[model samples]
Target chain A: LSPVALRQMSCAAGTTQTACTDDNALAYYNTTKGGRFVLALLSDLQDLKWARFPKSDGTGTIYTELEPPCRFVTDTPKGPKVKYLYFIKGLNNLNRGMVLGSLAATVRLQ
Target chain B: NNELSPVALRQMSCAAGTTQTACTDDNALAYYNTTKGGRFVLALLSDLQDLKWARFPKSDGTGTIYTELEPPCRFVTDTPKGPKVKYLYFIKGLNNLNRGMVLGSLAATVRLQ
Candidate 1:
């Protein structure tokens, strides 16, 4: 990541503690020129249940809720062209047919 | 309680981009460790459109899976019935017979507790 590149949040959620969480949602900034970006929230979590990027409400997969897209396009400029704030949140745990809160969610941006 | 939905990606689930692969099979009971538990739900970490199911609809192609990325996750939520948990995943360096590939995918086994 360059010093003046358009940035977004990307994190690694985990099953145990010390893993990233929504509280640790990746903070991004557009410190560069005007351009497009790819915004997404996905889990390296093999057994992920569901996921979202805050703005996700009308998207879902197997559960009828959550499960949003992996990429979005938002134009950013040299300064306050488009400063969007957000993070990735989900259950990024591999419980193996077990319980809830087994994993931590990782957010992403480009 | 709830229903388990399993959606299989016949080929690479993600399109060519800044990375390599990006899709998952959704579940992993018939896959890994002992977890003969309730049914699970699996969906593409990205959009169903971002997937590049190369060589899909395999009728007689080899059904051999290439890579298996672990550390899958299960997000839990609360409902009127009880606590609801579901499995999620991503894909990376994943490939099979048809030459479809992937990366950073998921594979978790979860249930309601």
Candidate 2:
């Protein structure tokens, strides 16, 4: 299912071993500018479960939890501008299964 | 556990990107590598490096045959489960009905002692 909305997230901060929350998870891909808009590899997302829920202590953070499927927006000059939404499964360490890790290479479209 | 009479191995369970294990006698087995319906490519080797046979699904469109292994492997029965030993595999050229050509591969951990 497609996420209706998503919040920005990161992978802890520096390493690729620790888990992060919904607001800062990362996704890595090798798509240069010449290539067309690419969908996330099916081999990568084929496994793992997904769900959607409220964020924070159920108070109000404007996010629909980690499974709302987080996103990262790229706006480069004279380059392809694309927004990436992270879809993951099997990490199972945070709210809505927030993918925690580091050294993740975000897809840089230029 | 490594010597026995060779028995013709006709078929076994398999998936392109998956690993399967079975017990057998360590003898001279013949591998012809042939099948029908859906196509497949099978390879075999002894060392951690090396390794066709092909087949397809059949009948009501839901049948499958087996292919032969090239060099074949040496073993006697199911290798007896003991300590957990890992057996990583990367097979190639596997397909069946409905599915197209596939460069399938899979990793598996086996038990040995």
Candidate 3:
């Protein structure tokens, strides 16, 4: 069992509109030096809400906030073994529907 | 919500080598097939002790023996299905050890309006 961290923040009206733009309130995390894994978001059923994360240009920095507040974390002593990070949404009343999103990036241990 | 019922039977045998005799026991689980025109499910539980040289036959004619507790079992079917079930034949042996083998069985016939 390794250290795992999850961050969740409800989307305020302002955050929803400025999302993905230059002035967005981005979610942030510092992975362990050798950490490499995936990130994902779980969706709501009745409302059909969705989520998205920012992509890195050729630059060393990436910025973007997830629409709904939900994140998954997995870290082991050997480092992150996640071959893929996926997101799922659109679960209505059934409480079982889930959709997978896109992968963030691949990290190599220093 | 109309009334629902199911019936089942159990059998044991004792004989030399391939030759055996059959005995029947009255036991089974029953439940409503549907509500508002949906699916119905049933779950049954049994407890039995075993003695050497005695084997129980499942509903499918498979010669097997059950002598221990088994997992929680369940059955599901469409509603207003047809022909109310009177007995559900559970496989031979004791609790948990019995397999799912319905010997004599019936389906629900009534439909929801």
TM-score per candidate for chain A alone: 0.19, 0.23, 0.22
lDDT against the true structure, per candidate, is: 0.27, 0.25, 0.25
- For candidate 2, write residues B19-77 as lDDT tens digits: 11221222122212234542223332222222233233453676554343333223222
- Per-residue lDDT over B1-113 for candidate 1, one digit per residue giving the tens place of the 0 to 100 score: 12222122222332222212432443222221112462222223321223332112222565523333223344553457787554333333322210111111221112222
**lDDT, candidate 2, at B94:** 21
Let me know the TM-score candidate 3 reaches against the reference structure: 0.17
Candidate 2 chain B: worst-modelled 10 consecutive residues by lDDT:
B98-107
Summarize candidate 2's per-residue lDDT along A1-110 as a digit string, tens digits.
Answer: 10111123232211122222332323322123432211111111211122222333555322112222333333357564434343343223221211111111123312
The window of 10 residues in a row where model 1 chain A has the poorest summed lDDT is A96-105
Candidate 2 Cα misplacement greater than 4 A, ranges: A1-10, A13-23, A26-110, B1-51, B54-80, B83-113
In order of appearance, the predictions have TM-scores of: 0.20, 0.20, 0.17
lDDT of 3 by residue, B5-72 (tens): 21122222222111233324423232212335532222232222221122344446766543222232
Q: Can you tell me which runs of candidate 3 are displaced by over 4 Å? A: A1-14, A22-68, A75-90, A93-96, A100-110, B1-113
- TM-score-based ranking, best first? 2, 1, 3
For candidate 3, the per-residue lDDT at A40 reads 33
Question: What are the DockQ scores of the candidates, in order?
Answer: 0.02, 0.02, 0.01
Q: Native-contact recovery for every candidate? A: 0.00, 0.00, 0.00
DockQ, cand. 3: 0.01
Interface RMSD of each candidate, angstroms, one decimal: 16.1, 22.7, 24.5
Ranking by DockQ: 2, 1, 3
